[PDB]
Design a protein around this nucleic acid. Structure first.
Lengths: 135, 100, 56, 78, 93, 47
RNA sequence: UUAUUGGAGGUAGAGCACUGUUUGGACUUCAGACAAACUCCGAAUGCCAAUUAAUUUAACUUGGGAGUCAGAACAUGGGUGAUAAGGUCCGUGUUCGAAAGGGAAACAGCCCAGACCACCAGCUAAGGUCCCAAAAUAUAUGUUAAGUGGAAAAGGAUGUGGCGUUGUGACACUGCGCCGAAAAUGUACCGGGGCUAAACAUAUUACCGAAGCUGUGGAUUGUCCUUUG
RNA sequence: CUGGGGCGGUCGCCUCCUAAAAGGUAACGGAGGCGCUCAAAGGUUCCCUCAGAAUGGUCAUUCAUAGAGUGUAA
RNA sequence: GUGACUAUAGCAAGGAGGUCACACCUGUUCCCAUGCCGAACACAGAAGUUAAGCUCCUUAGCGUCGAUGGUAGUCGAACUUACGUUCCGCUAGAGUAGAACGUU
């Protein structure tokens, strides 16, 4: 769905989930956006579901920017095995979202269609959010 | 050339250094024996005071150092080649009495 | 000899460097109290262990 | 699913071995390094293997060489 | 426009700033020709309703030396999770 | 591939200075100028 | 151990200047991001010294005699696992081990605190003060109606208070509450009774509470010689 | 050795990361290599400066602090 | 000329300044010289020229220096699981400096 095309290292230590957000805290590409208010890992598979909801709601009329990209490949081990004997295989790709980052941005839409689209997006992402407008 | 003569001199002067340092020109030669832990000069010699004059300047620097009471030296070719003019400048101070 | 300093908290369950500071002040037991002439360097020892003492 | 990792090398005790302001002897090792993270100052020998050592007995001092490079010199005490 | 700002004096401890921010005051800093860096406080609403009046790149008379100096707003920090401005930079002229 | 050669003073004293050579790229009896310390002198060495 | 100074070093953070990952524009470029094995940067601490000052009691060498090589929990920095485990493996500190006493109902590892012995003495620590059970039915101000207190999320919602901007309605923080909320012998997720203050939050007053400290007597070792006491 | 053992993998040496800015630091944790090779690829004195992007028909020019190269992994 | 300094010392641009020095320029006789070429190094030099190199000045575009204030981050407590007080104190970005000082 989304993933980097090359990675130097298939297997990585997992990112810090504790703390606040360092960058991407202000609307840049558009008028409105969805700000995060809770930390988690958002997978590519659900980034895409939120994008589909937002896109179909606006009739594919307005513009959308997915401000976050999954760079970090998390692993998993198979069904029923014991601990150890090496690290597992890449399950998927995740982004780490902390309080304050702007998950999606939209423009080309009034406040109400954008508000309902962003609301209908926030139900498919494991974090709490709120509606944000450019300063 | 001096922008690169200086580079070969800075290459020379990483192992070496009192100095007996030199400087050629289109017509002149500026010899001088210099300390290297205070920035102080000890003697002096120029060309306006091409190998006859090289011997002249060598003799001058050597007899000035003889008046100044210093014998053992280290010779910096200053990034020029040790040949002809600077060759004679080295072979005048040995022949005037000095240590190379 | 200003700075009457009294040891008012125990050192059981305190880090070890802290145990070292308080002993270097001369505080033997709890409620013990040493008088020490105010230095600029004796004061820096009653900040490493500010929580466990009482100064006056 | 065994793995083809795990092996490492013996760590080689590396870095500063004296202190800025300390008296050192005539052949004491001042610093250990790969390459030249610190260049030899005065009365410091840059021996083979890239280790920096003293020559005279004196006090050691980490200075810098302008920007982005620093050296180690040794002085006479008093 | 017209703004009155009183100096904050001393070392602003952590609790001191957290008291000025859970009250309705915004810490500020001033500088430029003749100002000489008076660390000040401003109303967290009054500044809004003065700069929303005189516009973004306007001109403002402040409590600088208990007099007006026609200050600017170079930058400003903004805690967005409460939508509250956290620090202002007044560039005098 | 590399021989492990043994040098031997031509004049006087023998069998010091072990080294190694490359046989295909030096298929010859090599020669060196080394310090024969027995006779305290620079001298030729072979093999 | 601390203060003063000098130092080495690339972690937190941050940033995109290099190697890579990446989003939107315009034709390499302007804005926006990502990193354990990226760095133009860069701490707090920890470490090394001075042969650097003030307090304190060790430090080292040479010999005699050992035990130990199954560790645990908690707090914090990580790997692995699934941001599972009272999991597992490392750094860091404490307690248990080898630690009795008070509190957490009971409860090696949590909080307070280190038992020489005796006393029907006093002050306190954690924790508390309606009864079980020693001490406030304390004082001032407010919140909460659910027995919340005294277990659990996404999500929902004319619950209730505060401050705020709006042109009687709308929103932005907000404190406390409601629903979501189903398990196996017997109430059974306050220890019980009971509680609308005996809950909560803030703020001064008291008192209770240990084998801690002090008081009095005693038994031993030590070291100063006030003054062989 | 071993998250019971067996089967599989491994066992000595080197370079990184984990590793918490001194040093040290574990796991059947994440990446690679070694068991040589040079008689010149050593010594020493001198001289020189690379990669790449364009303008042309190996060359020339300019731009270029290093993005080259350094026997051999980092 | 010749040393010392963390480019606030550099780049980039406009501007003048001549054989007194420093240059380029004359040439290969001479010592020496290119894996070919006096292009270079080096030797014999007087013309000629300020264009270039280059000393000197203007410039704050590009680099470099860089506060004050705030924030993140923690040392140590103290409640409990993410805060509260104390204390050190970032990067980034703006106020700014800055066309260098300088020994013999």
């Amino acid at each position: 769905m989304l993933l980097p095309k090359r990675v130097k290292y298939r297997r990585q230590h997992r990112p810090k989930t504790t703390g606040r957000s360092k960058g991407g805290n202000y609307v840049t590409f558009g008028e409105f956006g969805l700000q995060a208010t809770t930390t988690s890992w958002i997978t590519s598979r659900q980034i895409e579901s939120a994008r589909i909801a937002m896109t179909r709601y606006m009739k594919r009329g307005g513009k959308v920017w997915i401000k976050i990209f999954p760079h970090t490949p998390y692993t998993k081990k198979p069904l029923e095995v014991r601990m150890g004997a090496g690290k597992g295989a890449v399950e998927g790709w995740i982004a780490v979202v902390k309080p304050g980052r702007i998950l999606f941005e939209v423009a080309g839409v009034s406040e109400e269609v954008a508000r309902e689209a962003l609301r209908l997006a926030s139900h498919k992402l494991p974090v709490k959010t709120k509606f944000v407008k450019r300063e | 050339k001096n922008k690169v003569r200086l580079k070969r001199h800075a290459r020379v002067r990483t192992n070496l250094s009192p100095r007996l340092n030199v400087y050629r020109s289109n017509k002149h030669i500026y010899a001088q024996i210099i300390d290297d832990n205070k920035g102080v000069t000890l003697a002096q010699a120029s060309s306006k005071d091409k190998v006859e004059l090289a011997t002249k300047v060598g003799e001058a620097i050597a007899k000035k150092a003889a008046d100044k009471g210093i014998k053992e030296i280290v010779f910096d070719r200053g990034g020029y080649l040790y040949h002809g003019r600077v060759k004679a400048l080295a072979e005048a101070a040995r022949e005037s009495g000095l240590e190379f | 000899a200003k700075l009457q300093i009294t040891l008012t908290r125990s050192v059981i369950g305190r880090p070890e460097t802290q145990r070292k500071t308080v002993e270097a002040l001369g505080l033997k037991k709890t409620n013990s109290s040493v008088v020490v002439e105010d230095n600029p360097a004796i004061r820096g020892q009653i900040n490493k262990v500010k929580h466990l003492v009482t100064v006056e | 699913s065994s793995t083809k990792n795990g092996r490492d090398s013996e760590s080689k005790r590396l870095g500063a071995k004296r202190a800025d302001g300390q008296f050192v002897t005539g052949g004491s090792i001042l610093y250990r390094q790969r390459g030249t993270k610190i260049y030899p100052g005065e009365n410091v020998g840059r021996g083979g293997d890239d280790t920096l050592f003293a020559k005279i007995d004196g006090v050691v001092k980490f200075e810098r060489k302008g920007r982005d490079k620093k050296q180690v010199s040794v002085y006479a005490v008093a | 426009a017209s703004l009155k700002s009183i100096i904050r004096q001393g070392k602003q401890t952590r609790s001191d700033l957290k008291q000025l921010r859970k009250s309705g005051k915004v810490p500020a800093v001033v500088y430029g020709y003749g100002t000489k860096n008076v660390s000040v406080k401003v109303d967290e609403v009054e500044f809004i309703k003065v700069i929303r009046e005189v516009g973004r790149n306007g001109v403002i008379e402040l409590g600088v030396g208990s007099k007006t100096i026609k200050v600017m707003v170079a930058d400003y920090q903004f805690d967005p999770l409460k939508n509250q401005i956290t620090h202002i930079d007044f560039l005098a002229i | 591939m590399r021989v492990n050669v043994t040098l031997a003073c031509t004049e006087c004293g023998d069998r010091n200075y072990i080294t190694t050579k490359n046989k295909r790229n030096n298929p010859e009896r090599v020669e060196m100028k080394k310090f024969c310390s027995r006779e305290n002198k620079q001298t030729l060495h072979r093999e």
